[PDB]
């Protein structure tokens, strides 16, 4: 077994086994979260 | 070249801010765009007018349009003013002086609302960035921020240094501890937004888009984990509009209370608050009402609480209004009478009165005692003329043609007409022609204060444009009935004389200085040029992607430039028809382009709200003149190309005149300080029986402990190696008094693991030399719990990995 | 609609009372309502560190009592997640224990999709145990410094 992609859609699991709601988030950790994501997407 | 600056800026009364009345009917501080002005409301002269200062268009001036006032609050007893701007700024002011105190900068878009505290020394602000800041004014300084809502911050109300609700554009409710910062609850307050919140003792009133309008009881004192508000009723408002402002007042005499909903459209609703004797008295009878009816008690029960706004509440009445509704303010209640003020969205404000006796008011209407119209105009000014000497400025708008006199900036007159379209001096400054957008041509005399002359058929449309030749006898004009005719001035009424009928619609007539060409621009992308003397079609300038809108012919009749809605500027050579340069001027349509009297130089005004400066003969911009907050419609130069007027569509007339340490280094600094505060308490324990630290807020083992945590796992073993002995006893004397934490401990049990056992490895040989009796209990004590906390994580894991195959095994035998 | 969402505002409301005020019995049940991942873990962990200083406490052990089937292959899968790293297993771990020790076995089995839930927590498990024991090895250097002190 191993960590993948949250099975929700209203939420977001990482790798290092750690699930995020987007409801529980603040405004300000949703945003560096959708920056970490660009910069994943960018050089992939 | 010379710098233009705004001499004066005048035409507005009210602005898109509240207003705030001062009682001597008093006073009242609203705003002018950038500016804040106090009228005497008995007189209807302006007072006084508050400007920061730093004049759009010098060069120390900023490079964008000024930030508007969007609130106004003031302490009445301190005679402070707080004023809230578009770009999140908040200025105090001191009304004495007349000049800005502090200025605080928290939020990042405009400010909704501004509220003074009981004492006046902290002033709570709410912004569209949805938050909310306490500011302390003895100290300049912001001390803290409110941050749970998610959208514009509609309304709140703190009487108390205790407790705070707010209310958003999100539709909540929030409750505010202070002296937490936390919101405490959250109720939805109407199913969209939430514009309006009213508090009067557990009373308490809000208005969402629709005409629904809830009532909350307050009971701050609940502390029940919720319900310190509790929704009571609805009750219906007949506007079916958002309540935009809820306002209490209360009779000193009499202990009775009203409110209004100031509504988005042209009407104020006013409500009473029915007495405790009142509401028992009607209880009574509507129960005996309902008994007779027959219905049982609990349907009555129910009845009641369905009917439980009617008990408390009573229309009172409406102030209706001829224009829509920007801001209200009660401003006396008496007896006798009821009084509020308000201002419009048309430039003005309105004094309103009603009288009432005991329950319902004794006039059908509110009566209106006072108005302030004089010095504005209530529709966008489309076209403005000066006089020939330069010293009557005409403005001519939908529904009145008002003049000014540029020095005193004071109207002279005012005549009613027509929707205005066009206006220009005759020569002598004693007359005006107006071409209204029926057909009209209308012709007024400023001596006689009256119309002289209209011809309700001059055109079949719109007259677009109209122009006069440089002797004044001639009138050219076009409209969008594709004609352009020919007037004749005989002694004072006008005579057509000819006609010549175009292609298409007509957008703007221009005769040269030397009344030998007629440009005509055409709603087909072309500018005609016609000899005036003979009116022989002589050229047809191309080159526009869409209408040219504007057009001006140079002293020398060798230039003609042209401005369309295409952004773009053209300088044509006159004698073939050629264009010289074609500017990319503005970001929107540019309007109006006028040269500067005997010289190349010319303005341009577009929709983007920027007067530019440009030069004839190097075709580059020289000043950007940053001062309208909406479209500039008209333009206008003075013959001796002194000064320069501008209207907008925000109603200002404006004049402008002619002017490091390395991991291990940093665990030896902090076990040095830990350690030190440690021995130091261990020391004053024993007898009885830093800054550092307290600005973080952290224990001496805390603060070690986050050093270690921030120490890469590669860097940590070479960070420990270069540790001198010395350290080495001060960091088993942390781990010993780590110990003692259990906290600390389990949280962080396999990091003190690691770095523990590297250093016994490290310098075992030096450890064991010392014949320390201290240093053998530390290495005792760390010891046995080191165990203990260790078996135990041991033990439970090893308990589940049996407990968990014991599930898997019996899972198979059941279904194999 | 109206009032399931008028509902939702009170519970997030409350969870963040509950959790700013300690709490955590309270906070651990609305957290497996709203379905709060990172709230739920944090309440088990400060729950956690409280009872350092009979798994959590005599309230938050009965709360994980009353579970029921869906609530607790929701908890088993954060559990099984929080086991996949060392930073977080011993959290992990508690949990799991409490639902042993608070629940039926039998009836945890038939539970459709228990025992693949199950399968994966063991192997990560048994890495945590292999480690850890390793490390009371290493603590043993203390007694053989304090052997060589005596001497």
Known sequence: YNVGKAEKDGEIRLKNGVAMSKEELTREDKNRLRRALKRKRSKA | ?816 | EQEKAKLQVEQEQSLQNYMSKGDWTNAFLLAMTLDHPMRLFNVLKRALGESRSVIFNEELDQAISILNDEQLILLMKRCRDWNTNAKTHTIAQRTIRCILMHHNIAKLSEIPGMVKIVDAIIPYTQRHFTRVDNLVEQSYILDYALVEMDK
């Not at chain 2, 010098?58 to 003013?81: F, V």
């Not at chain 2, 006028?594 to 577009?606: D, E, R, T």
């Not at chain 2, 907008?648 to 340490?661: K, P």
Request: hydrophobic residues 40%.
């Open chain 2, 1 to 816: 070249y010379q710098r233009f600056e705004q001499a004066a800026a005048f035409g507005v009364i009210a602005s898109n801010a509240n207003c705030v009345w001062i009682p001597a009917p008093g006073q009242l501080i609203t705003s002018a765009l950038e500016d804040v002005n106090i009228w005497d409301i008995k007189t209807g002269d302006l007072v006084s007018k508050l400007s920061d200062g730093l004049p759009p268009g010098a060069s120390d001036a900023r490079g964008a349009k000024p930030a508007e006032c969007t609130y106004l609050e003031a302490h009445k007893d301190t005679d402070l003013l707080a004023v809230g701007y578009a770009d999140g700024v908040i200025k105090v002011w001191d009304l004495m002086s007349k000049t800005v105190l502090l200025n605080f900068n928290g939020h990042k878009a405009a400010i909704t609302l501004l509220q003074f505290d009981g004492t006046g020394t902290r002033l709570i602000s709410g912004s569209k960035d949805s938050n909310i800041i306490v500011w302390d004014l003895v100290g300049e300084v912001g001390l803290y921020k409110l941050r749970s809502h998610k959208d514009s911050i509609t309304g709140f109300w703190c009487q108390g240094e205790d407790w705070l609700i707010s209310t958003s554009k999100d539709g909540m409710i929030k409750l505010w501890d202070l002296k937490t910062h936390q919101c405490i609850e959250t109720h939805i307050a109407h199913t969209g937004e939430c514009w309006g919140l009213a508090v009067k003792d557990d009373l308490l009133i809000t208005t969402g888009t629709d005409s629904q309008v809830k009532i909350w009881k307050l009971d701050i004192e609940n502390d029940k984990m919720g319900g310190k508000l509790t929704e009571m009723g609805i009750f219906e408002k007949q506007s079916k509009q958002r309540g935009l402002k809820i306002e209490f007042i209360t009779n000193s005499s009499d202990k009775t209370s009203f409110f209004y909903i100031q509504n988005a459209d042209k009407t104020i609703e006013t409500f009473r608050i029915r007495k405790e004797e009142e509401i028992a008295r009607g209880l009574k009878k509507r129960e005996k009402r309902l008994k007779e009816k027959g219905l049982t008690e609990e349907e009555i029960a129910k009845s009641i609480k369905e009917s439980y706004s009617s008990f408390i509440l009573h229309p009172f009445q409406t102030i209706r209004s001829l224009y829509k509704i920007k801001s209200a303010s009660w401003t006396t209640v008496s007896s006798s009478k009821l009084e509020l003020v308000l201002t419009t969205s048309s430039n003005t404000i309105e004094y309103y009165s009603i009288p009432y006796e005991k329950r319902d008011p004794t006039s059908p209407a509110p009566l209106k005692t006072h108005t302030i119209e004089l010095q504005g105009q209530r529709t966008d000014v489309r076209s403005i003329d000066i006089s020939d000497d330069n010293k009557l400025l005409a403005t001519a708008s939908n529904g009145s043609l008002k003049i000014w006199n540029i020095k005193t900036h004071k109207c002279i007159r005012t005549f009613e007409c027509g929707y205005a379209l066009t206006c220009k001096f005759l020569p002598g400054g004693l007359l005006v022609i107006l071409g209204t957008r029926n057909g009209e041509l209308q012709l007024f005399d400023l001596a006689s204060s009256s119309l002289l002359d209209t011809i309700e058929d001059a055109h079949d449309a719109a007259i677009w444009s109209l122009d006069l030749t440089s002797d004044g006898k001639r009138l050219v004009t076009g409209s969008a009935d594709k004609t352009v005719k020919f007037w004749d001035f005989k002694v004072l009424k006008l005579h057509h004389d000819t006609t010549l009928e175009l292609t298409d619609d007509i957008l703007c007539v221009r005769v040269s200085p030397d009344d030998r060409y007629l440009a005509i621009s055409l709603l087909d992308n072309t500018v005609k040029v016609f000899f005036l003397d003979s009116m022989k079609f002589y050229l047809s300038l191309y080159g526009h992607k869409l209408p040219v809108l504007s057009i001006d012919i140079s002293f020398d009749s060798k230039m003609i430039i042209t401005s369309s809605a295409d952004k773009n500027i053209k300088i044509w050579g006159l004698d073939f028809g050629d264009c010289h340069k074609s500017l990319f001027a503005h970001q929107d349509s540019i309007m109006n382009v006028k040269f500067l009297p005997q010289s190349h130089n010319f303005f341009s005004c577009s929709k983007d709200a920027v007067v530019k400066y440009w030069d004839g003969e190097k075709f580059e911009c020289i000043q950007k003149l940053y001062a309208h907050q909406s479209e500039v419609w008209a333009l206008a130069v003075a013959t001796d190309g002194g000064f320069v007027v501008s209207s907008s569509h925000d109603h200002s007339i404006r004049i402008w005149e002619e002017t490091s340490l390395k991991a291990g280094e940093r665990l030896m600094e902090a076990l040095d300080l830990g350690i030190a505060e440690i021995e130091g308490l261990e020391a004053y324990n024993r007898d009885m029986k830093n800054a550092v630290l307290i600005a973080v807020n952290k224990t001496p083992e805390q603060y070690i402990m986050d050093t270690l945590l921030r120490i890469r796992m590669s860097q940590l073993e070479d960070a420990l190696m270069v540790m001198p002995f010395s350290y080495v006893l001060k960091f088993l004397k942390f781990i010993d008094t780590v110990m003692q934490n259990k906290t600390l401990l389990h949280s962080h049990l396999p990091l003190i693991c690691k770095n523990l056992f590297f250093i016994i490895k490290f310098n075992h040989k030096e450890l064991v030399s010392q014949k320390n009796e201290e240093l053998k209990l530390q290495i005792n004590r760390v010891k046995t719990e080191l165990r203990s906390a260790l078996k135990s994580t041991e033990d439970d894991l090893g308990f589940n990995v049996q407990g968990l195959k014991f599930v898997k095994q019996q899972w198979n035998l059941r279904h194999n």
